[PDB]
Each structure stands twice: as C-alpha cells, then as structure tokens.
Enzyme design. Sequence first.
Site, PDB file in Angstrom:
ATOM      1  N   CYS A  84      40.757  47.762  36.622  1.00 16.99           N
ATOM      2  CA  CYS A  84      40.199  47.075  37.784  1.00 16.99           C
ATOM      3  C   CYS A  84      41.041  47.300  39.036  1.00 16.99           C
ATOM      4  O   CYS A  84      41.516  46.363  39.675  1.00 16.99           O
ATOM      5  CB  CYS A  84      40.053  45.592  37.475  1.00 16.99           C
ATOM      6  SG  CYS A  84      38.603  45.230  36.477  1.00 16.99           S
TER       7      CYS A  84
ATOM      8  N   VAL B 547      32.911  44.300  36.409  1.00 15.69           N
ATOM      9  CA  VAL B 547      33.149  43.071  35.659  1.00 15.69           C
ATOM     10  C   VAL B 547      34.418  42.365  36.113  1.00 15.69           C
ATOM     11  O   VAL B 547      34.658  41.218  35.723  1.00 15.69           O
ATOM     12  CB  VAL B 547      33.205  43.358  34.142  1.00 15.69           C
ATOM     13  CG1 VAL B 547      31.911  44.011  33.669  1.00 15.69           C
ATOM     14  CG2 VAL B 547      34.413  44.219  33.800  1.00 15.69           C
ATOM     15  N   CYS B 548      35.253  43.035  36.914  1.00 18.03           N
ATOM     16  CA  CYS B 548      36.501  42.437  37.384  1.00 18.03           C
ATOM     17  C   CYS B 548      36.271  41.084  38.042  1.00 18.03           C
ATOM     18  O   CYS B 548      37.002  40.123  37.777  1.00 18.03           O
ATOM     19  CB  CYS B 548      37.186  43.383  38.368  1.00 18.03           C
ATOM     20  SG  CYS B 548      37.138  45.105  37.867  1.00 18.03           S
ATOM     21  N   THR B 549      35.264  40.989  38.908  1.00 27.45           N
ATOM     22  CA  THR B 549      34.970  39.739  39.599  1.00 27.45           C
ATOM     23  C   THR B 549      33.841  38.965  38.926  1.00 27.45           C
ATOM     24  O   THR B 549      33.867  37.732  38.896  1.00 27.45           O
ATOM     25  CB  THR B 549      34.630  40.011  41.069  1.00 27.45           C
ATOM     26  OG1 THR B 549      33.529  40.926  41.150  1.00 27.45           O
ATOM     27  CG2 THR B 549      35.834  40.598  41.795  1.00 27.45           C
TER      28      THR B 549
END
Lengths: 150, 938, 75
Positions: A84, B547-549
């Site tokens: 990420c 999907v990080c946030t």
Amino acid sequence: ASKRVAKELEDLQKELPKYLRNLSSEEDNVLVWHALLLPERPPYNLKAFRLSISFPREYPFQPPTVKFTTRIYHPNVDRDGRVCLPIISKKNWKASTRTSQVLEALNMLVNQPEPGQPVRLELAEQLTQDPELFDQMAQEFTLQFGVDRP
Amino acid sequence: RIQGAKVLLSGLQGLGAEVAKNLVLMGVGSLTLHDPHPTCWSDLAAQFLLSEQDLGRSRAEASQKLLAELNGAVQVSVYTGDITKDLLLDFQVVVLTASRLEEQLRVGTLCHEHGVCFLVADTRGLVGQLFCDFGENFTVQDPTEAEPLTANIQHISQGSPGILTLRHHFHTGDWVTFSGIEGMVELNGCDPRPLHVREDGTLEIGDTTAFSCYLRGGAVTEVKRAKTVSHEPLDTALLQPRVVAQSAQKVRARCLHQSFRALHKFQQLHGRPPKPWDPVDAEMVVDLAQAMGPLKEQLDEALVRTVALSSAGGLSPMAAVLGAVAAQEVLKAISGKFMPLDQWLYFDALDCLPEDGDPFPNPEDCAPRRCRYDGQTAVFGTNFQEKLSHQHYLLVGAGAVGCELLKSFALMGLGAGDGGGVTVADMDHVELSNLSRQFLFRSQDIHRKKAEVAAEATRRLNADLQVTPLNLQLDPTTEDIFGDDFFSGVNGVAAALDTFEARDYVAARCTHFLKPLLEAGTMGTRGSASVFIPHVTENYKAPSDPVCTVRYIPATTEHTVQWAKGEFDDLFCESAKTINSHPQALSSPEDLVKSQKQPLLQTMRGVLTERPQTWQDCVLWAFGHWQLRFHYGITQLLRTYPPDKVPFWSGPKQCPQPLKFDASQDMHLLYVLAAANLYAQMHGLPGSQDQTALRGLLNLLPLPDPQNLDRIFASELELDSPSGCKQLHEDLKTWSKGPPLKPLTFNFHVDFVVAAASLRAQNYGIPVASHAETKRIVGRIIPAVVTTTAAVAGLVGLELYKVVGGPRPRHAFRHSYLHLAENYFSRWVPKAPDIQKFHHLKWTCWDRLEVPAGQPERTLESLLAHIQELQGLRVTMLLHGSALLYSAGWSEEKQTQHLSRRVTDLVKKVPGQRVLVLELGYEGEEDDTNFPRLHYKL
Amino acid sequence: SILVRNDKGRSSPYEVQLKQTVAELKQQVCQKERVQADQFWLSFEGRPMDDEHPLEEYGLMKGCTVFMNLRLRGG
Ligand SMILES: Nc1ncnc2c1ncn2[C@@H]1O[C@H](COP(=O)(O)O)[C@@H](O)[C@H]1O
C-alpha cells in the site's frame, strides 16, 4: 508503453540502488519486473524479499503494482504481498513519476513502517502497543521464510 | 407517469417512424398514428416499418403492427379520419411530420389555444426542421439531467442565520431540505429553506434560533425547483424564430428557416415538391426566399439553392437524428422533465454533399426509378448507391447503437451489391434488460447471440445485403479472425462499444489498417459521434480504489459499495470455490499453513461449529456475522485508534460508532434476511421470505453479548500460526462431508449489498446510496436512452455518407456532441493530426515505416542499418509490443547475439501474420516520445 | 473570470487570464469539480478547446461561458 518501461529498466539495471538486487524481466515481457529487495531495518535485514513490479498496458497513466512474492510480516503489506505505497496510489500517481521513486518509497516503507496507514490492523496494534513482540514475531516470520542474502 | 399521456402522431414517413419507434420503446402507453397517404417508393429508403409489399396501403395501417411488436405494453392505434378538434382534444402531445404548412398552422393554433403540446418535425434531404410549442405556461420540474447532489453535515449552528459546516457545491437562493437529522427531529422532511454562500466555504440557512443542538450525522439535499416556459404559436414563430444555436450558427439556421418557408411557398404555388436537383425549381425557391424579406444581415442565396436542390429526398440518418430529438421533446412534454427547445432547431447536414469543385448530381441522375432507394438517390444519385452497395463494413458491437446502425445500413443499401456487406461482431447474449432499449429484439431472442439476432433482423429489413454475424469479440485474443485478410475487404469500421478500452483497441487496429473509424458513444442524454479518417484527422484518444483505505476507512459511497461487493464476493463466491477446489487444507494443517486461506474459511464457518440443520438454525449465522463485522470489528478499530489518538479522527475523517442490533429496524432485518437466504441457497438449505417468523426467531433467541466472540473467532495474530489452524481444522472436520457449497454469482443479491451499504454509510456518515445508485455502481449498468442512441447512430450514418463519398477534405467531416437535456448540439470540424517534430523527423499519428524481410530474411543488424540510413537516427531500442529485440544499453555480447539473429527468430511467428508492428526508439529521444511504428513486412 | 458548466448542470465561476493556457483552466476544473482530466474536454461557443492552445486563440470574452463535455463510455 513498453519502451518507457524498458528505458526505466535500463537506467535501473545500469546503476542499481544499493537496496535492490537481481532486477530482471521475463525477457519477453518488460512490463513485469522481478527483484530481491534488501531491507535495512534490524528485524527485516536478516533476509531478502522477492518482489514483482507489474506495469499495466496503460502504465504511463496507471500506477504499477508492487507485490511481495516472499511473504513478509509487515503492517503495510497485505497477506497476499500487496504493498500500500502512497506514490503508486490512484489518487496521486502522476505520469512524471518513475519506478526509481517508487522503489525509494518502498525501501523507506519497509525500513520505516508508518502504522497510521494500516493494511493488517492487528499487526499495527501489535507494533504500537508491544513493539518488542512485534519485532520478535516479525524476525521469527522473516527467518522462517526468506530468501538468502545475495 | 408517461403511461398517463396519449400521443397523436401525424405523418408516417421515416421521420415519423423514428419518432414512433422511440416513443414505443420508451413505453409511452398510448400512441395513435395518422397517415392516410399510400406508401410510395420514396419512403422505403427511410421507413423501416414499411416494405415494398405494402405499396398503395396506408403507411400508418401497415406500420401499426410493426410498432406494436416493438413493445406489447403500448396501445398502438391508427386513426383513419381527419385531424379535427375533437380528435385533437384526446391527446396531450401532437406531432406533425410530412404535413403541409397550412395544416401545421391549423393544428398549431388549436393546440396553443387548447393547451395541447405541439411538435413539428420535418426533414428535407440533408436539412432538418424541428418546432416546439408547449404552451404559454409550461412547468418544467427537473431542469437538470443529474440527480440532486446530496451532502452530509459536520456541525450546525443555531440562532441568527445558521452557519452550516459540511464534511458538493451550493448557490445563493437555492432551496435545500434535510434528512436523517438527529437532535433537530423536526427538520426531517421539512419545507425547503433558502441558502446563502460565504467565502470561507460555510453556508447560511437563515433563522434557526429555536432548533436544538446538533448531535451527529445529518444529510442535506437541494430540491430542483420548477420553472415556467412560454412558447409562441407557429403562426408567429415563423416571423420571429427563436432557434437554438451558437452565435456563429444563428445566421445559417435563420437562412435554413427562410429556405423552409420558401419551400412551403413553392408547394403552395406549384402543388408539387421541387424536382430532384432541378435548377429551375431551385431558382424559383430562391426567388420566393428573397421575396419574404428579413426576419424580425443578408440572405445566403447559395445555401437556399443547395437546400432546394437537395430537398427532394428522405434519408435514414436524418430521420433518426431528428426523430430522436423530437421524441425526446415529446417525452419532456409528457413527463415534465428537462428543458424543452426554445422554439426551433435546424440541423444542417449538407456537408455530406460533394465538394464545390466536384460535379453535383444531375436532375435526371436523381429521377425516381421505382426502387427502395428513391428517397436516397434523390439527393446522392444512383452511382452513389452503386458504390454504397459495394461497401463491406465491420460493425463492432451489436448493442443499441449497433442495432440502430444496422437499421441505417439496411435502409441505405450498404452492402446490397456484390463484394459489399456488413460484418457484425458481438460476444454478449441478449439479456432481458436489452429489450425495450432497442427495437431489434423480441421474447424469442432471449439468451441468443446479439450478432446473430441482429443479422436476421437486418436481413428482414433488407434481404439484399449480406450481414455476417461473428460471435467473437474484437480484442488481442481474437487476432486470428480479424486479421489482415479480414480487413483486406473491409472498407471501414463502425464502433458501438461499451467501454473505453475496446474503443482504444479498435481505434489502434483502425490506425494500423488505415480504415476509417466511426465511433458512437452515449451516457444518459449525452452522445457523441466521431469520425477518424487516416491521414486526415486525429486518432481516437481514450481516458485511463485500493483495499488500503476501503478495508478500514471508507471516505466515499464508492468505497462502501466496493467493500460490500467484496464482502459478497468472498462470502458467497470465492471462499466456496476455495473449499471445493482442494480438500488437502481440510485434512492436513501443515498444507493449510502454506495455502494461506484461514480467515475466509473461519468466517464461513461462522459463530456455529456444526453444519446448520434448518432455516431457524441457519438464521443465527447471518446476525452472528452482522455482530462480527459491524460491532466487533469496529470496536477493535476504535480501541486500536481511540478518538483522541495521536486527533486521528479529524478533518474529513470522523470517529465511527458500532451498530446495535434491533430486529424492529428495517435495515438490520433486511441484512439478516438477505445474508441468511444467500447462505441457505449456497448450502442447499431451503430459503424463506417469512419476515414475521424470522423476526420472531430473532427476538426469541438472541445472543447474550457480542464480546464473547473471542472464544469462537481467532485474531489475525493467531490464525497464521499452527495453534489457530489446528483448532480450525478440528472445527471444520465435519464440513468436508456432503455436497459442495454452490457459489452465488452476482435471489437477494441486491438486497444484501444495499443493506450493507446503508449500514456502512450511516456508520461513517457518508451519504446513503439509493437502490438505483447501488445497482448502477455494483452492476456497472450504463444509464442509456434510446433517443440518444438513435441520434448518435444517425450522426454516424451521416459521417458514413462522406466516408463512402470517396476522398474528402478535413473540413468536410464533422465530430458531433449532443446533450438533449439542455438543448445542446454541436458539430465541429475535427483538427488535423498533430505534427510531432524530432530534429529532421516529422510524423503524425498515422505514419509508419515499411521494410521488407526479403526472400532471404535480413538480419537485425541489416534492419537497423536500413532504418538508420532511412531516418537519419541510430536505433537505440527495438521491441515487438513488449519483448525487447534490441537495445544499445546492452553489453556487447548480447547486442551481437541479437543482431545476428533474424527478426522472426526473436519473436513468436503468429500464424497467418504478414505485418509485424515493431516499436522503435532513437538516440536522444525525449521521454515518452512515440516514434512511428515499423510495419516490418514479410 | 468565466463560468464553466460542469457535467451536473451547475455553472461554476473560475478566475483565469487571457494568456493563461487551457491546461491550467482544465486542471482548475479538475480540482474543483473532482473529475479526472482525461475524461472530459472544454468547449467555447460550440468550438472545442485544445489544452495546448492559449485562451487568446479561442476568444474567451470577459464573463463568458465554457461547457465541459464528458467522454462517453458507450451504449
Ligand atoms: N471488444 C469488443 N468487441 C466486440 N463487441 C464488444 C466489445 N466490447 C463490447 N462489445 C459489445 O458492444 C455492446 C455495447 O453495449 P451497448 O451499446 O450498451 O448495447 C455490447 O453488446 C458488448 O458486448
């Protein structure tokens, strides 16, 4: 788009950053890169991590995806290896940025976890509340499954 | 709402057929046709409802059946009498096509006096006239295409005109309403309040002194106010035409208006239309036009003469475009939505005519010949029809635009003769949702291929042309069929794709093969038609959350919808396949550790450890997962990130709150129902819809507390270790028996995601998506309108006229963008391709270098030397798509090894390939420079 | 200062200079209307405006209007 990716792969292979090793494509697909990241944080430096950088067909406009093939115990890396990283986010990836900057940000993320950007929230809570146990489990996990340092 | 309005339609020429088709497809419940005139050959070139079999028969009577078959829920009727006042008063909207001016005035005066909406639509060759008359006072309720922009409140200030803080755009004088307001419970559904805008981003909503303190949440939505529209009667609009056009096109539209008035005078004075391309009749029309005087500036006599000469025809694309506009105006009158046309709309398509220096069609060249195309040859001539019959066109996409294009092709006669044809390529099947958005499909066509059904229907419209259906898409995986040998006969490509990526690929192929590409796209009432001609215009340029946030902080509605969709995917589609694929993980934890599949399996096992036995037992799993996802997880998030975390929940981010279960509430009950039904349909258990029995079961056997789930649900810190997987296998030892779980591909599909999205949106304070919005986001369904489809297909056909007309200058072709909801229609001349300059090299988006391999194939060094001497630059890089054949950055040994090899020994030889597209980079190249591709020819 | 009519039908004011290029105006529209650049284009008096060209070559008068036009997915 492949020609730009080839130019970037050339300017990286001709002078690799110290924290990267064994950068190579599949020799018929320059849009996928394989590398061996060399961490420097005390827990992670015991092993090297296989890495895959995938460039989309729309690469100049769409950010590449960075994925750890070797499983890593990290707060910012998902359990499938997805990283990420903020620079490769769809929100602020700009065509002028290059994969060298991406790998700089990745090295800084691996060497300096920021728990405020969780992916595995339990690992972040472990890091913030009992960082000694986070270090113990991370070292155990990286030693259990990790590529030998080249 | 549209079912309550009855529409009268006089005139059943091709334009009336287009209007009727659009109105029937959209579902106007009642339509009456009126055209007693017998069918003539001049109508078969534009009327898809009529064939040569019904010659002499009334157009309306013969077309009534074909209109009824398009939509069985529409009462299509025919009136055989005169248009009197008694007949007129039975309809809300009356449309006149193919009607003389005196009849138009007589009908329009009555309609204006008696409140009936009045529309005139007529097409004369390549010119279109549309007139609206919606009364002295017409209320338009929704003058905006898009839905009102909902927003959410962060804080509310009381007392003097209140300051609103928000998490959107607003204007002074706008009226807004409030929903989901806590504390100020009286503001829910209250009367709209005026709004003011401050420079600091806050808003003022006037007096709020008596209202209580703000608690949390709250949503504000502006209400689209209605507006009054006044329209003048046709008796006066002829003298003061309020035509909608740009400042540049006002005079041209005014001259077309005067040309139509002169044509009507010609009809009155001679009793017949002008003979096709007759100079005498054109000169008389010009004399009549100059006799009228200026409108309440000099008149263009050449424009009037060209219109007079070309007016003797009826064209399918013109019918489609103008009938689409007229049908959208009819729907505006019926439903009150959007803004109607001010008074007039004139559409000029004379660009399709031959150039000034080129020979114009002769008066005897366009004489009627008792054929289908008498309405087309009346403007374009007979040799134009002969060259049209020879065209072989690839139509990609058999969708709505593709079907309207197929109608246009059949009416034009494209591919009627030898050597010509159409190839229609589409992989998708006919879903039920594809009906009533297009006329080419019926009940017997469900789940059959779109291409085949479209081919059969186009053959029924015209048996002459060879429509070949290919059931394969056009992408890199289908190069073997749509190769060079296929495009050798193809004269051009018409694109009605559903995505930007397919458009990009077909545009790249069109650039590669030097094929004119006509491109048609729609969204809502917006449509575009583009034409890309090699070496004349530019190429098609296509546009481009983690999907990080989404997994822990959804900031937008799209985030919550994607989270719910992924939850559905891994609870009902993916993890079931993971269970069924390999039983090794269910018999050996050592391989289970390696497989990395613990969390999905654990959450599918649920709070239960045994397999569910009945519906009343399986229903526990749904609300157990509800407690796990919506209470336990958010509790963990809150305890890991406290409200005063160093705060973290500041600015756009706000502190969330766990959800408390209550069976009496609609959202929790719907979530439980949908989840339980999906689980039962996966497991083979019988589903049920008894909400009363389900809520009785919910309030009879509830969980005591949600914190105890620690004894049943293992943490992420523990499921990755043997201690977790061992007990997981112990629990799952009973789950490996019996039939496998059935994945549920996205019945309760929509209900689950809707309930999850509503719960998440109320949890994080983002706006709650409606049913239609959730369906659009999660199913990726395109907002589409039949009228825009027909208009865009007509514009594409108009460009096809010029493409078939041989060589043309860039100024001839037009790109078009239309937005019917606000009366926007722009046709502009596309720009020339941009000249890329690099030292002594100049090239455009079309250029290339062609080099033969030779009877003995040359080595790579020979190719590089040839290109270096041809261009003047040394080749520093050479690729085949993504495989690097050569680079000067390489070491000497690798360079020499690759230079000695032949090109075909460095790249895979695709079967049947004769042209290899290689990508080149030269010395000193600036970044991202796209040099011309080498078309290495075998 | 000009008006830009967005996709949602609302005319928003922007401040821009005559010598300022269409690229800056487009990016301002992108940040204000929260829409990516590649998905829309601008038009003045029906004529489309290219990003590379300046505003002087398109005759944007004081307080004039510019329309945004979205690139269409399809149908
Ligand atoms: N690459 C492609 N090749 C052929 N047909 C396509 C391709 N992409 C989409 N289509 C079809 O084009 C049609 C466009 O959708 P619509 O215009 O909404 O009916 C659909 O039937 C799609 O299946």
